[PDB]
């Protein structure tokens, strides 16, 4: 048993270390020591350990992501398997109430892990038999079968999310073990010592929300680390909360460290002429600063060793994110008006508030500003915190967007978070020019909105025009099929054919139609000029060749 | 119609002249007040139509809709899928054997429930049926 | 049917109940004395005694479909 679980920590087992670690951690203080701390050491070493790569971006040695996803009898999926890749999924497709569903269950499955992370023996969201359960099932039950990824050391950790209905004989239960083992070890390991933690979020379509700018001041949560996994996969980011944390960073930078530890503790010197030549009790008067400097320099020793990054690192961090994804955001800042706290951002070259930003970019700024906070709360030991560990869900990624940010969207989301797993789901085809094939799944239901298998897109998409993903990808004509200007060119063919290739004059009015309609200089004219040139030139050769035959 | 504002703080503030598109609506409301006219209709909907609504307007609806609700919410939320489906399943309830005048709704209240038998016995608002608004 | 004639049967003021859809949103009414009034309008003890009626002859009728009278199944009322 405990032979067994060494061996399996030195050929390389994050769960043998942790639970070796667990059963001899409870040994009198002396005794088995030294073997805790290596066990410890080694679990932490498994979280932590990673290496920079040739491009400067740091990756773990073990990296966290979802492969697998099963959804038996769910909504309206028979069985549906989706695998996952490490960096990047694109769900595809016309039906997008149940992409909407796929995203909802892996939400839900990640709530776990979200849970056990932040307490021990917590519960994540539970299926609901009014709603998940299918009512065309016989099995009169429905589970949503998980796999996730840690590394070599723990390759499988499934999960699985199941409901019945009632009154069924026996009761559908769920298998949510293997993923509190995996949350216990991160919040067991964070505990005893600061360790990088998962950053799970999910953006739903809420996501487009008007802003509210006077912000409630519920000043002391939005601070705390585990304040990253509040409203995490409830589908609108916290921005409200990520407003207030900027403004606390940017109060705790401008002030309160330049003086830093400085007059603080100049109160107990000044109270003391009353402690020493006042009243003999005087207690209640220095009753909560004396440890109050105690805590707050525990608290702060994160901040001035090698731990919890500095308030204005953080905030510099924020602000080159929010600057680099988002295309149109120079530069963001907090300003002080007479009575007010506002955030000020320069959009487009000029200085605006957040509440005057366009939907599109105040939606963008809103997505990106809430994952770095996010990742700056959870990654405080690495040099940049965006290439932390996670996996987060966007539902429609181009809303809001235009062409030109839809070319770049990915792109720039991919650069500043290196490492994230993002399931995006997404409708146009500017989006897929800058996604790879192998990347993209396709959810072509049936009338019972049921598939069984998502599939990838024949053609690579990654250096392909618009156009061709258009048509080959989503079954849309380039062209509207719809107006009658768009079948000018074609009739106008058969025209030439019709007469052997000759412009005659149902061709001539048509030639002029189209001369009229879409210009000199318009691809359309050229066309139509072209294949006059080809008619008349193969008229001639016609003619040529029945010289040299006959 | 200039519609004008000045900041905050500025001494001078500029005004908004609206007259002449106050004398152009008291022209269609007084002729509608005399002799009925149709009217214009104002729409505006903005991105904010596909967010999900609601305010218990279940039997909120059930309040005789007045032809000038048309103008109540028009620049606004006027767009959402939700007013539309409780309205829409309102009207087809009202016109099922459409019948209902402002008296008419007692008659159909007989004559589809206790027939009985062997028991005993504006010029401003005006819209089109009920049944031809749908 | 059977849950009307439970209905009236017990509650001695109401003597007939229906549902009413033109008016477009659904409402329940009973005959209270004689005179057709909503169920909304009912006065406290007509309408507390109604809805432990109403809620027992449904629950009654659900649970026993077998039962010629589902009001004749068994089990323990408080």
Known sequence: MTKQYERKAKGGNLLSAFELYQRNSDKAPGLGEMLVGEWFEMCRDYIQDGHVDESGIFRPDNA???????????????????????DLTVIIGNNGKGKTSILYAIAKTLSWFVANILKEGGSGQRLSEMTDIKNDAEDRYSDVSSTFFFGKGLKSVPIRLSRSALGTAERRDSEVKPAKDLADIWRVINEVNTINLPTFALYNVERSQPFNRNIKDNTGRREERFDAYSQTLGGAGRFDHFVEWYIYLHKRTVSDISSSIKELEQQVNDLQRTVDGGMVSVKSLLEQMKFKLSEAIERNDAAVSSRVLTESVQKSIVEKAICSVVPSISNIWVEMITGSDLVKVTNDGHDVTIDQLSDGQRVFLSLVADLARRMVMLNPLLENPLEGRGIVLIDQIELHLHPKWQQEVILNLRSAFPNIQFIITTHSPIVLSTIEKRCIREFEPNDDGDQSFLDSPDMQTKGSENAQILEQVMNVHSTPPGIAES???????????????????????????????????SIELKKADSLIRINKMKNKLNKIRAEKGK
């Not at 063919?493 to 005659?504: A, C, K, Q, T």
């Not at 001539?508 to 309609?517: E, G, S």
């Open 64 to 86: 966290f992501y979802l492969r697998r996803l099963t959804l038996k009898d769910f909504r309206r999926f028979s069985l549906l398997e989706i695998k996952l890749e490490e």
């Open 487 to 521: 079948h000018w060119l074609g009739n106008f063919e058969l025209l030439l054919l019709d007469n052997s290739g000759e412009l005659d004059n149902h061709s001539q009015v048509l030639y002029d139609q189209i001369k009229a309609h879409f210009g000199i200089d």
